[PDB]
Design an enzyme around this catalytic site. Sequence first.
Site, PDB file in Angstrom:
ATOM      1  N   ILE A 116       0.857  -1.204   0.000  1.00  0.00           N
ATOM      2  CA  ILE A 116       0.000   0.000   0.000  1.00  0.00           C
ATOM      3  C   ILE A 116       0.887   1.246   0.000  1.00  0.00           C
ATOM      4  O   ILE A 116       1.995   1.255   0.579  1.00  0.00           O
ATOM      5  CB  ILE A 116      -1.005  -0.013   1.155  1.00  0.00           C
ATOM      6  CG1 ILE A 116      -0.346   0.249   2.510  1.00  0.00           C
ATOM      7  CG2 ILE A 116      -1.822  -1.290   1.143  1.00  0.00           C
ATOM      8  CD1 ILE A 116      -1.362   0.230   3.682  1.00  0.00           C
ATOM      9  N   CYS A 117       0.410   2.254  -0.710  1.00  0.00           N
ATOM     10  CA  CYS A 117       1.039   3.578  -0.818  1.00  0.00           C
ATOM     11  C   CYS A 117       0.244   4.518   0.068  1.00  0.00           C
ATOM     12  O   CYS A 117      -0.932   4.824  -0.278  1.00  0.00           O
ATOM     13  CB  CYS A 117       1.019   4.048  -2.257  1.00  0.00           C
ATOM     14  SG  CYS A 117       2.003   5.541  -2.392  1.00  0.00           S
TER      15      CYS A 117
END
Length: 166
Positions: A116-117
């Site tokens: 995840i960013c």
Amino acid sequence: SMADEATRRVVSEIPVLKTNAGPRDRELWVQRLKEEYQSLIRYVENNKNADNDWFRLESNKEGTRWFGKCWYIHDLLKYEFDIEFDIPITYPTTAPEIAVPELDGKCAKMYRGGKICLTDHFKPLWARNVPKFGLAHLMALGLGPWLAVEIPDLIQKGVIHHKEKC
């Protein structure tokens, strides 16, 4: 500070961690893991009392690899995603990188491989709190609000479908 109050509201009943130890640090790492498990289990208990029991996590014996599940509710349907992460050698000063492998290539707010960013505000927020935050805080402040944007978006775009079960 809006940021300071927003952080406090999300984390104030999660036990704070103390020990500056990562995976190579022997008895100090064992102690850090006691802090991690005591913080996680209190967070889970608080989540159950809040009708928001939204994840389960387990680790390998050394506490260096974590894996489990999170749940997200949208329009009353419950979506389950497998999650995993490694503990960096320079934990807890460095934050772990949560992966949701089934969404690899499906979400713009994600790196190759399914990490995840998060927004840029997460890293300095973690940095400013070292070594008080641990895995419970990474879930509350990182994955939780990431799901609350990306899972509605991917359901609306027809990327995520709910499987008809039971």
